[PDB]
């Protein structure tokens, strides 16, 4: 089963797994500046992420279709 393509697939898979695992582990350090607090509170107060907010925010969208069903 040591075809070139199985070995190639497995080598790339190991490399990409290693890279993605390490990046996931370092996700915390990379850009958790002071800004973590800015972004958390901005997220908290997005109206679309609170009750009735999805409809409110979608209601404010000009776009709509020429439905002829």
């Amino acid at each position: 089963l040591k075809t070139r393509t199985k070995v190639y697939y497995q080598e790339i898979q190991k490399e990409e797994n290693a890279k993605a695992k390490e990046m996931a582990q370092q996700e915390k350090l990379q850009e958790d500046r002071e800004t973590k607090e800015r972004r958390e509170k901005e997220l908290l107060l997005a109206q679309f992420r609170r009750l009735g907010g999805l409809e409110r925010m979608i209601g404010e969208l000009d776009i709509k279709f020429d439905f002829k069903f």
């Binding site: 697939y9 790339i12 898979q13 990409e16 797994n17 993605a20 695992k21 990046m23 996931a24 582990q25 996700e27």
Partner: peptide, 8 residues
């Protein structure tokens, strides 16, 4: 080609 959910 990487495996799923490898971002833990």
């Amino acid at each position: 080609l990487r495996d799923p959910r490898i971002d833990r």
